[PDB]
């Protein structure tokens, strides 16, 4: 499935994820802008038998359970499959784990690199949230 | 500045059921996770449940997955642990605890309660 | 779940020795191991987390310990409010388990 810009940012809110930590929709939306471009079926093997899964790349070593992956902790206590889908209930409350780790939506790369200090504001401009 | 009040007794009937409740101040509610362990007579502490306040989302421990039941109220900063059809065995102190300042790896619970002490006794 | 495994229930010594509480868990959990204090008062407080980071507040003479699947508490210089019960909890994975706790006492 992909979303598309408001319907997933209306989803993310609707899953209290505005403000959550301190960062607001804006934020959310981007990030799973440049991370799956809305595409739930966003794959990707890491050399270190980790994939992340899901709109929000969420790594399976840590935070996710796939079987195949060494080393497991399954913090959000979710099997990945659940990342993967029509809707954000578990990637959303999963990411709130992750953002709340330490330093915070860094734990997201693409976010990092094209987002940090933008206006993000934009990302959700034309959504009647 | 991160507190979580705890009424410290609670007389109950056994079969009937119980609402603990946990209010919190200092902090940004919603923003945290909320977690419950329970200290049986004489023995360990239990970990027996998580819950979101934001999207009201519960993370459960197996074993109590039907005893307790996690819930939130956000306009009043609160939450709330009911103990379904209690007994005998489930009377105990019971306290509510976040994970605030630390990263989440860490499972750091830290800033607890005090305590409801359930009495079951008809 | 992980068994969080303390061998002694009760432990004595004299307000002044130094106090050494074990604690052993299952499996490797990458010092993700915390140590809490029970006092006889019912409140709970966080006194290392992570192996040894002494939590903030906690008095220098608290020492966490260990690595892999051996850890302990280890207290310096025993002393008043030190007397209560302590707990050890891991981190790593769901469901958090804690020890069965190993309570102090005034050697007499």
């Known amino acids: 499935k992909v979303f598309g810009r408001c319907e997933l940012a209306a989803a993310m809110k609707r899953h209290g994820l505005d403000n959550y930590r301190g960062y607001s929709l804006g934020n959310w939306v981007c990030a799973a802008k440049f991370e799956s471009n809305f595409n739930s079926q966003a794959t990707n093997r890491n050399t270190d038998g980790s994939t992340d899964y899901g709109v929000l790349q969420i790594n399976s070593r840590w935070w996710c359970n796939d079987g195949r992956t060494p080393g497991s902790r399954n913090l959000c206590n979710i099997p990945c499959s659940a990342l993967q889908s029509s809707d954000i209930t578990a990637t959303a409350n999963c990411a709130k784990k992750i953002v709340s780790d330490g330093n915070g939506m860094n734990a997201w790369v693409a976010w990092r690199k094209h987002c940090k200090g933008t206006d993000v504001r934009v990302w959700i401009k034309g959504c009647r949230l | 500045q991160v507190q979580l009040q705890q009424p410290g007794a609670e007389l109950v009937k056994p079969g009937a059921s119980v609402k603990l409740s946990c209010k919190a101040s200092g902090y940004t509610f919603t923003s945290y996770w909320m977690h419950w362990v329970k200290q049986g007579p004489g023995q360990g502490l239990e970990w027996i449940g998580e819950?979101?306040?934001?999207?009201?989302?519960?993370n459960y421990n197996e074993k109590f997955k039907g005893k307790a039941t996690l819930t939130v109220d956000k306009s009043s900063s609160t939450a709330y642990m009911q103990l379904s059809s209690l007994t005998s065995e489930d009377s105990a102190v019971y306290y509510c605890?976040?994970?605030?300042?630390?990263?989440?790896?860490?499972?750091?619970?830290?800033?607890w309660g005090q305590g409801t002490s359930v009495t079951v006794s008809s | 779940d992980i068994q969080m495994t303390q061998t002694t229930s009760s432990l004595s010594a004299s307000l002044g020795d130094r106090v050494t509480i074990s604690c052993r868990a299952s499996?490797?959990?990458?010092?993700?191991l915390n140590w809490y204090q029970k006092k006889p008062d019912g409140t709970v407080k966080l006194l290392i987390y992570?192996?040894?980071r002494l939590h903030s507040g906690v008095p220098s003479r608290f020492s966490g310990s260990g690595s892999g699947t051996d850890y302990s508490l280890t207290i310096r210089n025993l002393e008043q409010e030190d007397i209560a019960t302590y707990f050890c909890?891991?981190?790593?994975?769901?469901?958090?388990?804690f020890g069965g706790g190993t309570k102090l006492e005034i050697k007499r």
């Open positions: 909890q891991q981190g790593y994975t769901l469901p958090y388990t």
């Open positions: 819950i979101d306040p934001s999207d009201s989302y519960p």
């Open positions: 605890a976040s994970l605030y300042y630390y990263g989440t790896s860490y499972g750091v619970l830290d800033y």
């Open positions: 992570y192996t040894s």
């Open positions: 499996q490797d959990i990458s010092n993700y």
